[PDB]
Write a protein that binds this DNA or RNA. Structure first.
Lengths: 147, 117, 53, 101, 112
RNA sequence: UGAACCAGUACCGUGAGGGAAAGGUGAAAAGAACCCCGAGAGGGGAGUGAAAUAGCACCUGAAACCGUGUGCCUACAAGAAGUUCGAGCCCGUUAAUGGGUGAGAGCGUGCCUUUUGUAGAAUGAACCGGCGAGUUACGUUAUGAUGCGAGGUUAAGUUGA
RNA sequence: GUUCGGCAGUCAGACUGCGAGUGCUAAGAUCCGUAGUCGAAAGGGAAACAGCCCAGACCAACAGCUAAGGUCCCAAAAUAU
RNA sequence: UCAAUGGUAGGAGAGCGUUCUUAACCGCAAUGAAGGUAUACCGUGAGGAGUGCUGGAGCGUUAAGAAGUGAGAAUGCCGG
């Protein structure tokens, strides 16, 4: 009666690799489903300690389909612990410079904020204008839609 | 009649401490923080006698919408097809078919396809 | 000045970690002993191989 | 291989799988059969099974006993919360050979 | 036949916490290293551990004579005993006592 | 009994006064000859005794404290220090749906008095053990129990253990 | 429900509306009547929340269904029509 | 079978455990009482025994009576 559950993963994990891209795709609608795959939530094998952390690959990450004037009023912030620690990276700015944390900080907002969330969330694969590198392994392109 | 029952009193002390053993550090080297420490633990073990119910069911429905979503199927219209479906409204054994069941899983999914149909 | 709460003895020993003593380098059995330290005098008057009481 | 809900617990049985189940009016070991078995289940065979007939769990009844006396003190207000219950359960270990599938 | 090379001591005021500063150097090494550091120890606590140490080699030849050059320390421990207090005066009726630090001093050596 | 013990002792205070602490070796000291370490004590052998973890404050020996060894885990972690599940490891039991772990992950504001409401920056608690608080004397009322019943009832006292 | 008999404690509460009063028709302000709530009632919802809403817990359970409220991720259900 | 089982101050009922009880009932005890210790049993609870070990003299039953009688917590106390 007692052990009708099953992990089937918590030692025997999988490892798969996915080139996931669209050049312009909107940020939220990409973000929560690449969050779903970096969980492996879409994989039918969930465990709260699954470690189905997908090799979530992005290249050519120049553009969000940017609704409204969000490149003028998105503006980010930060706070260094020195008092009066406002330091702001702003809206359209550093998109053209380095659109990396332009994504994965928002996917930190996606993820379950814990050691596993920072595990695969700090195991993203991020490229902004590239053909990336190390196709020694086998990468696979995932979808287009927000499903 | 100035009597004590001293060893009996310490046997209540001994009884609750031996039943209290295991937690962090100083606690069994003391008395009273350990007293809640079993006690709080089966307060919400009493809640988890309802909440591993209500979270293993989240594992159930979550993994079954994971495989349904692997067939591109959403849980609400799937279950809606399960009430549309047969004498089966069987739930969580139908969650347990996450192992290796294209026959049971995708075919019962097709039963739901002819239930929405 | 005056402490607030009890030191937990594990943390008390975590204070007591770096407090340890350091072994001095002892010259071992010379003839069959006895001993000095390098840059120091034997019990037989010897530093630099000559007896000085 | 089959699925049977004896109590309010629907159960994958394998044709040989020892399981556990709450107390039934079996007495010591009389290996009796139960009949509301709904699935072919764990199949690798004939499919479907909305309501199954003749594939009943010919149950190889073994034993029933006491589970584990887990305990109860409850609810914590301040000002003298109060007191214990706590029991075990007359569980029922029964091996299941011989489904008709 | 047994190694059993143990001696002990009692009723000496030596701060066993600082003897637990002493024994970490001891517990692994050969007795030549032990009397090496022990003769060259700039603490007061570790001279008289040749009473136990010499008395324990003197156990090993008291009724063994075994592996006398070969003897590396098996184990030690030095514990507090009953620390004898004394009602020390301190200003305006303060006068707190003093725990004179008793110690058992226990050494086993063996081979290998 | 303050006081089982050289107790009204020690001790405080000039005084009037106050006022402590503490019993147990072993049957029998048969109290550890000797030998060795050690300045000595103390130890260690020997032997003693039914027993030496039994060695002079010595039956029995927790408890806080300090340890020494031990299987597991932890040096990308910000918890009333928990559950529940559980990777993985180790071990095998008031023989048992075994235990010791526990990474990881979900959800989780200590306990007491008072208050309208305290998680508390409201108190209070260093810890551990011991002590430590709703009685009885007589009376009334209520409720039952029993006995006999318009009749129940002996008080004080006397006898007697 | 009454009656009779013991045995109690409670006197000082808030809060949410709703209708009053006083107050700058200020207030988590007072002071009424009125219902609920807490107190003395968990769980869920609203980010934590004593008072609002829902829903009153003997217990097991690896059952389902549902209240409000939700269904892009944390965080489960609709990238639903 | 049906219905009930949040619950503080409140009130009612019931039971556990300690000690002494000459009572008896009736045993244990050196092959080991009590007491301690580990213990992966049982009992709705309080609680109960089993085993391993210390330990070397009183203890347990049952049932009933009687109680300085059920211990955290107070600048509780004393001792460590």
């Amino acid at each position: 009666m007692m052990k009708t559950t099953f992990m089937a993963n918590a030692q025997n994990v999988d490892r798969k690799w996915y080139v996931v891209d669209a050049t312009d795709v909107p940020l939220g609608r990409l973000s929560a489903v690449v969050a779903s795959v970096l969980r492996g939530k879409n994989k039918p094998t969930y465990t709260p300690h699954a470690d189905t952390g997908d090799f979530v690959i992005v290249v050519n990450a120049e553009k969000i389909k940017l609704t409204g004037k969000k490149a003028t009023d998105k503006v980010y912030y930060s706070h260094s612990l020195h008092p009066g620690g406002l330091k702001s990276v702003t809206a359209g700015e550093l998109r053209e410079k380095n659109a990396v944390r332009l994504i994965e900080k928002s996917v930190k907002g996606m993820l379950p904020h814990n050691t596993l969330g920072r595990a695969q969330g700090m195991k993203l694969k991020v490229f902004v204008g590239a053909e990336h590198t190390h196709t020694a392994q086998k990468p696979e392109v995932l979808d287009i839609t927000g499903l | 009649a100035r009597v004590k029952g001293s060893v009996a009193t310490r046997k209540r002390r001994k009884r609750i401490l031996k039943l209290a053993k295991g937690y962090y550090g100083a606690k069994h080297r003391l008395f009273k923080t350990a007293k809640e420490q079993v006690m709080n633990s089966y307060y919400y073990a009493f809640r988890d006698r309802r909440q591993k119910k209500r979270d293993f069911r989240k594992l159930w429905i979550a993994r079954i919408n994971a495989a349904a979503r692997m067939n591109g199927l959403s849980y609400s219209k799937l279950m809606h097809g399960l009430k549309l479906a047969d004498i089966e409204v069987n739930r969580k054994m139908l969650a347990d078919i996450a192992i290796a069941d294209a026959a049971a899983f995708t075919a019962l999914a097709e039963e739901a396809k002819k239930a929405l149909a | 000045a005056v402490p607030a709460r009890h030191t937990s003895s594990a943390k008390k020993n975590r204070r007591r970690t770096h407090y340890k003593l350091t072994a001095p380098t002892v010259t071992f059995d010379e003839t069959t002993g006895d001993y000095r330290h390098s840059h120091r005098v034997s019990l037989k008057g010897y530093y630099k191989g000559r007896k000085v009481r | 291989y089959a699925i049977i809900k004896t109590g309010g617990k629907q159960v994958k049985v394998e044709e040989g799988s020892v399981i556990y189940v709450e107390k039934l009016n079996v007495e010591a070991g009389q290996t009796v059969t139960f009949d509301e078995v709904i699935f072919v289940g764990g199949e690798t065979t004939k499919v479907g099974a909305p309501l199954v007939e003749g594939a009943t769990v010919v149950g190889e009844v073994e034993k029933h006993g006491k589970q584990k006396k887990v305990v109860t003190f409850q609810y914590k207000p301040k000002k003298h919360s109060h007191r214990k219950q706590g029991h075990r359960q007359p569980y029922t270990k029964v091996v299941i050979k011989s489904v008709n599938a | 036949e047994i190694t059993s090379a143990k001696a002990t001591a009692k009723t000496v005021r030596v701060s066993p916490r600082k003897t637990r500063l002493v024994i970490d150097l001891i517990r692994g090494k050969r007795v030549a290293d032990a009397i090496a550091i022990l003769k060259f120890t700039p603490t007061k606590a570790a001279v008289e551990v040749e009473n136990v140490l010499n008395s324990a080699i003197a156990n090993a030849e008291n009724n063994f004579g075994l592996e006398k050059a070969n003897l590396v320390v098996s184990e030690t421990f030095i514990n507090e005993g009953p620390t004898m207090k004394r009602f020390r005066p301190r200003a305006k009726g303060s006068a707190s006592p003093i725990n004179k630090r008793t110690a058992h001093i226990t050494v086993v050596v063996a081979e290998k």
